[PDB]
């Protein structure tokens, strides 16, 4: 019938916390990694602000962040993708050739753009994006998760809220919410391709910095301090 | 409520769906399981022919969908016949966790399949829900090397629509069942990712020609489609 006042507060808390998330070939690669570093730090600070993340064991908190960080970034990329200019903004704006010039393969870049256009067609507002990020963080099937049951339980409220929210925004379009959730399936494959991209960069004498190598290369000391 | 036109479709899908070497020694046990995998792959291609619209797509795409889907369909089938009373997972070739471990499968791969199966069991899926979930899995637009993603997404929508409508009728009060079912598709991508690592580990300690076509890093797969 309608959103429950308890959810309205929770949604509104999530979007507000999110809006505070703001700074304005090897050299090109080394540039992008510093952008990745800043965004990772913003995500961990955001993850602290989500209800219940703090409650979990650090080992699980790490396990969720390692896997989630690439997918949250790809969601953020999709949110600020401009279909009028074909540029992705981090107001650090970049085109497809800028990503190619830094050593990223075309098999990885083109799908991110295709993913972004598909996300654009769904017409997601900030509340939908915020809830999608919460659902993404609390994924029970991430590797090396000690307490999958607790993680699944923390996810349910955000899936419930997202269901209720999508029903109010577009009552007639029932298939929007299923299609949104099916983008989570696409983020897993794009995360899988990203690991191949990392390895392909190593071949081109392009190795990751210390924070990013903790999460993406294959004792997360850097990641503990921020938590 | 459901449209009777869908109903025939569901009923056709469920009906279509309902239709070896000695087990001892590790290599013999492994060689046993591969022959079970061979038979099940052949059953899936015959099933894929019976799904409406699969035949209409180009062979190159038909291959691309089957390569990726086969592991996920098998894991769905494993979950369907997982027994929580006995912890055991062909017609009645029953196996326990130690049987899988004895054949050289690592525990990092076995335990998640069981955890996945228990999670699937908690959802309480009937044969219609399983059947529709399999159809949705086959028609995934973001599989690698797909020439016609638009047509694949279009063939998927009716099954997602049917699954939505079906789940609403079966349990009107439990709204979160359908979202949780679709989120299992996300879990199948990671389990497919782990399965590729499992295959490589084993080579380290080699698959039969048919599987190696689908899983190792296409003549058999064409003949089954050409019939
Ligand atoms: C190269 C490093 C390791 C820093 O970055 C990545 O490997 N990636 C992976 C995801 C990423 C993103 O967020 N947008 C986007 C668009 C196209 C390709 C790659 C990406 C990000 C990324 C790429 C470029 C700039 C910032 C982040
Ligand atoms: C490596 C080989 C080819 C043997 O098999 C697989 O790689 N797999 C991967 C998926 C599989 C299955 O279908 N059920 C199940 C349950 C536990 C573990 C593994 C599986 C299957 C599989 C395993 C055992 C028997 C038949 C199929």
Swiss-Prot record, chain A:
Ubiquitous. Residues 6-218 form the NR LBD domain. Sumoylated by SUMO2 at Lys-169 and Lys-207 during the hepatic acute phase response, leading to promote interaction with GPS2 and prevent N-Cor corepressor complex dissociation. It comes from the Eukaryota. There is a cross-link at residues 169, 207 (Glycyl lysine isopeptide (Lys-Gly) (interchain with G-Cter in SUMO2)). Residues 3-218 are annotated as: Transactivation AF-2. It is found in: Nucleus. Forms a heterodimer with RXR. Interacts with CCAR2 (via N-terminus) in a ligand-independent manner. Interacts (when sumoylated) with GPS2; interaction with GPS2 onto hepatic acute phase protein promoters prevents N-Cor corepressor complex dissociation. Interacts with ABCA12 and ABCA1; this interaction is required for ABCA1 localization to the cell surface and is necessary for its normal activity and stability. Belongs to the nuclear hormone receptor family. NR1 subfamily. Nuclear receptor that exhibits a ligand-dependent transcriptional activation activity. Binds preferentially to double-stranded oligonucleotide direct repeats having the consensus half-site sequence 5'-AGGTCA-3' and 4-nt spacing (DR-4). Regulates cholesterol uptake through MYLIP-dependent ubiquitination of LDLR, VLDLR and LRP8; DLDLR and LRP8. Interplays functionally with RORA for the regulation of genes involved in liver metabolism. Induces LPCAT3-dependent phospholipid remodeling in endoplasmic reticulum (ER) membranes of hepatocytes, driving SREBF1 processing and lipogenesis. This is Oxysterols receptor LXR-beta. The gene is NR1H2. The chain holds residues 217 to 458 of 460 of the full protein.
